[PDB]
Amino acid sequence: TKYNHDTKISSELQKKEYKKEDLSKINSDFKFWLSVENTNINYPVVQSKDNSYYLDKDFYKKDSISGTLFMDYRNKSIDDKNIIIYGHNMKNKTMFNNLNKFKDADFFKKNNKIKITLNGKEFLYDVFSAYIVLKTNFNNESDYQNYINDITSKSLYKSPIKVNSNDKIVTLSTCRMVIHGRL
């Protein structure tokens, strides 16, 4: 078990989160907290003006090979139809490494929910597709519904959770393992 600077910072932020401190004041790019059931994915999510900045920058905007979990710069509101979050596949089993657990059929069968926590509100998304291999914007419902069909059938396993254009979707992607939730 490796204790290094990255693992320390992230466990401290988890604690500030539990002590309900305002993390915006540490980094104005903070958007919400993210956790995934039955994993150690339990991190802060930030947003830059691009999809690159926080690849190599910790929550304090110092260098880090762990980066910070960040949301696609195109995302606007919690009501976006696909909220996309990116994070790394770290070797010490941190960040988005545990997305791999969704490779396990039985694990997948279970209902592990993705939990966005924002402004004292909890948004639960039920995972319904996972696989190894990205749109935030849809011009209308047709494109959307096609996106849903597209990613539903890319799933390694058929989900008992069914999904359509009246649901909102979250997408946890590594930067290649990928999973989609539905609200």
Numbering used by the authors: 29 to 161, 168 to 209, 217 to 224
What does the paper say about this structure?
Sortases, unique to Gram-positive bacteria, recognize and cleave the C-terminal cell wall sorting signal motif (CWSS) of substrate proteins. Recent studies have demonstrated that C. difficile SrtB (Cd-SrtB) can recognize and cleave (S/P)PXTG between threonine and glycine; however, Cd-SrtB cannot recognize the sequence LPXTG and NPQTN, corresponding to the recognition motifs for Sa-SrtA and Sa-SrtB, respectively.
However, the density map for residues 27 and 28, 162–167, 210–216, and 225 as well as the C-terminal 6xHis tag was disordered. The Cd-SrtBΔN26 structure possesses the sortase-unique protein fold, comprising eight β-strands (β1–β8), three α-helices (H1, H4, and H5), two 310-helices (H2 and H3), and several loops. The characteristic N-terminal helix bundle, absent in SrtA structures and unique to SrtB, is composed of a 13-residue α-helix (H1), a 310-helix (H2), and a loop. The loop connecting β7 and β8 that has been postulated for accommodating peptidoglycan substrate binding was not visible in our structure, implying the flexibility of the large loop. Consistent with previous studies on sortase structures, β4, β7, and β8 of the β-barrel forming the Cys–His–Arg triad of Cd-SrtBΔN26 appears in a concave surface. The catalytic residues Cys209 and His116 are located slightly beyond the C-terminal ends of β7 and β4, whereas Arg217 is anchored at the beginning of β8. Based on our computational model of Cd-SrtBΔN26–PPKTG complex, we are able to identify that the hydrophobic residue Tyr167 in Cd-SrtBΔN26 forms specific interaction with P4 Pro in PPKTG, confirmed by site-directed mutagenesis and FRET-based assay.
